[PDB]
Amino acid sequence: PQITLWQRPLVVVKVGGQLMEALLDTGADDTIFEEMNLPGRWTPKMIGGIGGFLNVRQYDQVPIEICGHKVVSTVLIGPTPLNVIGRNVMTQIGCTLNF
């Protein structure tokens, strides 16, 4: 559906077997969540934004469930003060900006 921006655009997500809230975030190329146990192998990744940079772990082809949409996506795990749904996932649910 359509979402205004008077409040933060938080949505409920399931990943991979856990429930989280995350921010629909058009300024993020990538999807990043707080420390949680994703299963399997990961590759080290550094990313930077406002206030500096973190070391994150990149998990590929992680099932994510967002609203009614199931997708399989790359997911970074590392310190973020908020879970963020990035363009890599939003494109897959057909999310656009409009004004």
Ligand X SMILES: CC(C)CN(C[C@@H](O)[C@H](Cc1ccccc1)NC(=O)O[C@H]1CO[C@H]2OCC[C@H]21)S(=O)(=O)c1ccc(N)cc1
**Catalytic site residues?**
25
Q: At its nearest, how many Å lie between ligand X and the CB of residue 33? A: 11
One-letter amino acid at 19 equals: L
Q: Where are the beta strands (DSSP E) in 6-51?
A: 10-14, 19-24, 32-33, 43-49
Q: Are 18 and 83 in contact (CB under 8 A)?
A: no
Contact partner, 43, from a second copy, ligand X, none, Cβ < 5-8 Å per class: none
- CA-to-CA distance for 48 and 74, rounded, in angstroms? 17
The tokens describing 63, both together, are 């099932």
| Pattern 52-91, ligand X, x by CB under 6 A | ----------------------------xxx-x-x-----
Q: At its nearest, how many Å lie between ligand X and the CB of residue 45? A: 9
Instruction: Report the residue number, 6 or 68, with the smaller CB distance to ligand X.
Output: 6
- CA-to-CA distance for 48 and 61, rounded, in angstroms? 22
Residues that bind ligand X (CB under 6 A): 23, 25, 27-30, 32, 47-50, 80-82, 84, 86
